[PDB]
Design a binder for this molecule. Structure first.
Ligand SMILES: [K+]
Ligand SMILES: [K+]
Lengths: 354, 354
């Protein structure tokens, strides 16, 4: 294999650094550098301080689009090969959208990105669609049994056909995690937790995305939770809808609740933090991780809510050791962005292999 | 690095096969083979059917001991470098054993193995102790907070000092999993579940043992389970003690229960299978695995009990896909054995690096 490409993407790096840090011959890398450097994928430049030259990905060699699909909205993120965001957007969907209605918005978005590059004399080279639930990553199909207008449909294929580019389909929480990895320049281990409409985790280990054998991983949304009457999934309780709909009962705006200073709100948020923790504790106790990053809906609850989760987790932890809870602070769209970067690796990995 | 050593252990393999299957130069492997073959670690032999030669680990180059520690007993497994079992044994401990009482039995066992090799003109080269709970694998300390007479003690160090060999300390469920990997010649992914006295999982992914950042992984024993009155750990409910002690109430021998054909037994075993599944489902939904192997106490409940677990898991599975449940069928001591093989890799990996 190669994937010095993986490292050149990580950051500018010289031939000596690659050969040493990865392990290989000066003549092996020197030749591959010749290919990359010829294909217009990479460039060599003197470093800002005898002297030395590094390898950098050339922004011009690839433009790719990432997309996130939710029940209420579709977001897109267009990047160059340096993963600079050229444009990002979001098109809401109508109440209860069809297969056909949802696809139309998606086609619209892709046509917009295809056209925008073509007017700038270049092209859209590939695309990665991010969606909820389990996914057939090899065939490019959304397996999610739950009512989604894009389930059991050869999505990658119909897009490939229609557009003549490379298309992948990928779990949304996984792509959120990929988004944090790159936007934060991390290479450690953590879990990126998706919240709002759906619950799930993207699991990153030593900088790589963790993958399951059956199209899913980190699925903490199916954590069995007993509410006092019957059992429910953790996803049914943390759902952004169920939360605000319940606050319609409370009387309280979506935010005002906390500003209300009502014990009833405190105890309701405590209920959710407790449940949520059960799922986090599973991840921690099973994967043996320490770092967790929360994204989406739960950000809106603030550090007052994060303090409770921290506490619930400290309390029920297997033994006393440090655990880092945090919110994501990536400017939106974090999932569409991760999906875009996913498309970039996979497109560059494919182009070099030929 | 090397760890063609890892592959030569896997099975007999030629220089061409290594160079190709792993990726390297004919002259790189040819030189390393020279080292290994000189150190008496490896041998070259014509294959049983122009002709070709393979590399095999030489059984004579290393003899190592594996040990499992339980509250009631200590078991040992002595092997050669081909991982043939030379001897295995088990010494029960008295009711509620001291640090000193437990260590005495352990010293006795190690002295027995040290002496047995020395009378055969060789020596005991290393040792791996397997124990329950979280473990400081780098310093060789059993961190388990739960009352264990060997907790918070520099175990590896005091053994290293006393014996002058290499000593490691390792999680018992992890070593059970390692035991299955090698005894079954598997290189796929699965979870080995320890049952009886304690509950836990050893997680293997693509043939390697999965490790956490904090001295543990696969800890499903701390799965929160609501019994109807209050919450308890899954470990408190599946505990071999709690089960048989409860059967003292039932009236029923430890086995007769099932042969009794009593609905009360059926429904009690159903209760446990249900709980147990909650923990298995976490593993499956989080790690995205499909294969599970159960060992220990639960074997004694038979396929009638495995059929129920299978069912509970099928039912609550994220989506309809195949899941393989099975019991371990390794002749005891499976954990002591895995620990022995762990010691062998680590001893051979250390000896070659010098
Ligand atoms: K996931
Ligand atoms: K474990």
């Amino acid at each position: 294999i190669s994937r010095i490409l993986k490292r050149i993407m990580k950051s500018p790096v010289s031939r000596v650094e690659l050969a040493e840090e990865l392990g290989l011959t000066k003549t092996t890398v020197g030749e591959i550098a010749k290919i990359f450097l010829e294909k217009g994928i990479v460039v060599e430049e003197k470093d800002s301080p005898r002297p030395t030259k590094s390898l950098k990905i050339s922004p011009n060699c690839a433009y790719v689009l990432g997309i996130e699909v939710t029940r209420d909205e579709i977001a897109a993120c267009l990047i160059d090969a340096s993963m600079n965001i050229l444009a990002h957007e979001a098109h809401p969907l109508p109440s209860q959208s069809d297969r056909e209605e949802t696809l139309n918005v998606m086609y619209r978005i892709i046509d917009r990105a295809k056209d925008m590059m073509e007017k700038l004399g270049s092209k859209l080279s590939a695309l990665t669609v991010a969606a909820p639930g389990p996914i057939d990553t090899e065939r490019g199909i959304i397996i999610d049994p739950r009512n989604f207008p894009l389930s059991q449909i050869p999505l990658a294929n119909l897009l490939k056909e229609k557009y003549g580019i490379e298309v992948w389909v990928e779990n949304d929480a996984d792509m959120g995690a990929v988004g944090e990895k790159w936007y934060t320049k991390r290479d450690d281990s953590f879990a990126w937790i998706l919240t709002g409409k759906g619950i799930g985790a993207g699991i990153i280990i030593d900088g790589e995305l963790y993958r399951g054998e059956n199209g899913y991983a980190g699925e903490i949304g199916y954590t069995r939770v007993f509410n006092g009457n019957e059992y429910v999934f953790l996803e049914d309780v943390c759902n952004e809808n169920v939360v605000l709909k319940h606050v319609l009962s409370m009387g309280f705006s979506l935010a005002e609740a906390r500003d209300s200073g009502d014990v009833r709100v405190k105890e309701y948020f405590d209920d959710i933090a407790r449940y949520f923790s059960i799922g986090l504790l599973n991840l921690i106790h099973l994967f043996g991780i320490s770092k967790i990053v929360i994204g989406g809906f739960f950000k809106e609850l603030g550090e007052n809510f994060l303090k409770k989760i921290k506490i619930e987790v400290e309390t029920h932890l297997l033994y006393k050791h440090s655990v880092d809870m945090s919110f994501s602070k990536v400017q939106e769209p974090v999932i569409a962005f991760g999906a875009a970067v996913h498309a970039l690796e996979n497109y560059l990995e494919r182009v070099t292999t030929s």
